[PDB]
Every structure is written in C-alpha cells, then in structure tokens.
C-alpha cells in the first residue's frame, strides 16, 4: 500500500481491501515521512487498541 513502485492517477484512484490480517498503525504513526496523518473518527493513539 505505502511502498508500491507506482500510485494511481487521482481520476482513477485505486482501492485495495485490507482484511484477514493484523494492523500495526504505530509503525505508520511513528514514521516521520508522513507530512499529514489526520484521523477523523478515531485518535491515532487508539488505532492499536
């Protein structure tokens, strides 16, 4: 998702279904590469709980 070689053009934006897997949003949120990481119905610290 985050380390693909190429992303979609916005007019034809891609949609991947993440499922049957464990997610560690601390690996995302601690990563200083993200110039925006804004959450809209949860706090980023709660994504792990």
């Amino acid at each position: 998702v985050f380390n693909a070689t190429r992303f979609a053009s916005v007019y034809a934006w891609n949609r991947k279904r993440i499922s049957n897997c464990v997610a560690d949003y601390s690996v995302l949120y601690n990563s200083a590469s993200f110039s925006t990481f804004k959450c809209y119905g949860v706090s980023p610290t709660k994504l792990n709980d």
Binding site: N30, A32, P44, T45
Partner: protein, 48 residues
C-alpha cells in the same frame, strides 16, 4: 495581568516537532523529552 510563579523552559528542536510542544500532543518530544500538562496555563514560542 499578573503571575504567581513564572518559569521559562528553553530548548532546541526540529521545526516539524514544534507541533508536538502543544498540550496533549504525542510523538518522541512529547513522549520522552518534554511533555506539557493537558490544562497548561502559559505560552509556547518558537523561531527558526
């Protein structure tokens, strides 16, 4: 206005991490170096 006690805390950081200095924020400065209380009465000042 008047002030009952006053303390100025001085330090240097990356300019991206200036946000982490606000109260209730989180990340390496706000977590392991310098945390403000949630009900912080005071001001945060920063310059390049």
């Amino acid at each position: 206005l008047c002030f009952t006690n006053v303390y100025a805390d001085s330090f240097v950081i990356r300019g991206d991490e200036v946000r982490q200095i606000a109260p209730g924020q989180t990340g390496k400065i706000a977590d392991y170096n310098y945390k403000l209380p949630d009900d912080f009465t005071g001001c945060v000042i920063a310059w390049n």
